[PDB]
Amino acid sequence: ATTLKEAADGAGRDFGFALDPNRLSEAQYKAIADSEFNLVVAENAMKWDATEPSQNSFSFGAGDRVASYAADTGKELYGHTLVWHSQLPDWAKNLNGSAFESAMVNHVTKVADHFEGKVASWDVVNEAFADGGGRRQDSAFQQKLGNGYIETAFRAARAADPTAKLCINDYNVEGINAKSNSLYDLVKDFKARGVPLDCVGFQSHLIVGQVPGDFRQNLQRFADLGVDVRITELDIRMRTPSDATKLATQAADYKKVVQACMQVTRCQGVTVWGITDKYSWVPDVFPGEGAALVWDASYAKKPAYAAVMEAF
Ligand SMILES: O[C@@H]1[C@@H](O)[C@H](O[C@@H]2CCNC[C@H]2O)OC[C@H]1O
Secondary structure, three states, rough: OHHHHHHHHOOOOOEEEEEHHHHOOOOOHHHHHHHHOEEEOHHHHOOHHHOOOOOOOOHHHHHHHHHHHHHHOOOEEEEEEEEEEOOHHHHHOOOOOOHHHHHHHHHHHHHHHHHOOOEEEEEEOOOOOOOOOOEOOOOHHHHHHHOHHHHHHHHHHHHHHOEEEEEEEEEEOOOOOOOHHHHHHHHHHHHHOOOHHHHHHHEOOOOOOOOOOOOHHHHHHHHHHOEEEOOOOOEEEEOOOOOOOHHHHHHHHHHHHHHHOOOOOEEEEEOOOOOOOOOOOOOHHHHOOEOOOOOOOOOOHHHHHHHHHHHH
């Protein structure tokens, strides 16, 4: 193959990227987007703050641009994300009780309905658990609504879009730990009772040199619960600036991740959280860290590129 897209296509899997619609006007950016991936997800365009800035007042412009791009270039469309504690507007945080639950249900319904027939899969709920096990402790949904908001969100999502794959997504759940176990119990519960749930997303925002050795094992146990699995926000950050050894390790790490997916028949594919290090979210969140993507700030393919192709 000559592109990661062909390599992924050939393996009967998806290889996507997190898109920023504004960057499409940058031809280099769009050139790589057009030919290196077969799936696209909105990095921010479909989140609550970008879609419902005022109560029951939606702005689908950016989200629609992302959907149009996927349809125009023949890529699968992945929705991110309907319920998340972060990037939630103040108006919603100022609500509580039935008023808040109402706002959440309305958000899920309206956004799912708007993209019905376009978005193939949805991260209905994102980052619901806590490192160390149990539910997230700094979430407006967990605090104001309790354990049941997850189930409520999925059922409402299914009520709105009866065919889309409904997923739950999270990070630090790549390996088998207290966090992935709490997630596991939830998914098992849902499938046991018929709560609509079709997939589980493993963000995979890893650190160079630290890829969970039981990633494959973990993906398989979830897949065996009767649900699809997917690497959704892959990037492997390092201390900047990069050098040959760091880039070599990063490459091996990308290979380990993609191979873990290739080894689980129900692993739909791998989505990297961005195209170029030039725009990666890492530097601003993890000062001193970066160079986490497949293409560097000058759009040159990094060693990670070859590793991804051989892993597929
Ligand atoms: O631009 C940044 C995004 O990349 C970031 O996306 C999150 C990364 C962590 N996993 C959940 C994703 O939505 O969100 C913050 C934004 O500033």
